[PDB]
Design a protein around this ligand. Structure first.
Ligand SMILES: [Zn+2]
Ligand SMILES: [Zn+2]
Lengths: 76, 233
């Protein structure tokens, strides 16, 4: 199942996921094409920060639904 | 990418820190070995790149000072094949007020969509046009982040029929005219005591909608956005 992640500037990235994938796995797939350690990345969905431990199915994420990426350099 | 590497490198040294050219040497060595342990991310950096990125970081207040040291309310920045662009190393340009208003409006609109426009502008002002770290705290917790902005007629003793203060428009217009005219519309709130209310300017526009008042409010927002951007002058 293929979803999207949008950075702050507007650049879009397209990533295929599975229902058992962890938020850490999604961060890894993002840094595959971004090379940014997960300590600095943050994922936002419906105004709520993605919990790293949780699974992609926990937030009931569907295909195409954009999980907005945001940077956090200070933390980490 | 250069900035994230820099912030990690400077986070590693605590209060021991490093010299400016020492930090330059470390980042240059890292990029020479490359952040790639990839090809989507990784061009050759120069000392100009290091100085530019550390200028941005200094503007973000993350570095303090010949000595250079790591740090822990402040200002923010506007923040506005592949080898073809990469070879073009260079990158300040001059903006016009119309363009400034356009970019500010677009930014506030996009951040509002990320999370109503009036509350968005109010909160952005509350952080002095700060980074989305305010939104990050919001996602961490709403209550204090909201509290940052705090989000007969009594004033007009002449009686008339009918933030928890539904007062007549006459005294509201008087207060708004006093604040805007005195150029003190910064941090507008309900004059009734213990009523710190983040003012939706549209509601304030309902309080008074004079064509000169519109010019005053537009000029005030322009000045406020300009004064809180770390790069503008
Ligand atoms: Zn009144
Ligand atoms: Zn009040």
């Amino acid at each position: 199942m293929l979803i999207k992640v949008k950075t702050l500037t507007g650049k879009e990235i397209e990533i295929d996921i599975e229902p058992t994938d962890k938020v850490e796995r999604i961060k890894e797939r993002v840094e595959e094409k971004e090379g940014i350690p997960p300590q600095q990345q943050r994922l936002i969905y419906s105004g709520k920060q993605m919990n790293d431990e949780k699974t992609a199915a926990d937030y009931k994420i569907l295909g195409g639904s954009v999980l907005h990426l945001v940077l956090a350099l200070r933390g980490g | 990418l250069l900035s994230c590497l820099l912030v990690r490198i400077l986070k590693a040294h605590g209060e021991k820190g490093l010299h400016i050219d020492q930090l330059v040497c470390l980042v240059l060595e890292a990029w020479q070995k490359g952040p790639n342990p990839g090809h989507t991310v990784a061009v050759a950096c120069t000392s100009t790149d290091v100085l530019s990125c550390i200028l941005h970081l200094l503007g973000q207040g993350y570095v303090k000072r010949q000595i250079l040291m790591y740090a822990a309310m402040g200002p923010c920045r506007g923040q506005a094949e592949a080898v073809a662009t990469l070879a073009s190393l260079q990158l300040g340009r001059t903006m016009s007020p119309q363009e400034v208003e356009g970019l500010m409006k677009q930014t506030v609109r996009q951040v509002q969509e990320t999370l109503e426009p009036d509350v968005a502008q109010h909160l952005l002002a509350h952080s002095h046009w700060g980074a989305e770290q305010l939104l990050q705290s919001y996602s961490e917790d709403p209550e204090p982040l909201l509290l940052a902005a705090g989000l007969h007629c009594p004033v007009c003793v002449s009686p008339l029929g009918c933030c928890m203060h539904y007062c007549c428009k006459s005294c509201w217009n008087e207060y708004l005219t006093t604040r805007i005219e005195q150029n003190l519309v910064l941090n507008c709130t309900c004059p009734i005591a213990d009523c710190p209310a983040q003012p939706t300017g549209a509601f304030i526009r309902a309080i008074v909608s004079s064509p000169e008042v519109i010019s005053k409010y537009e000029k005030a927002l322009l000045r406020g956005y300009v004064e809180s951007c770390s790069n503008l002058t």
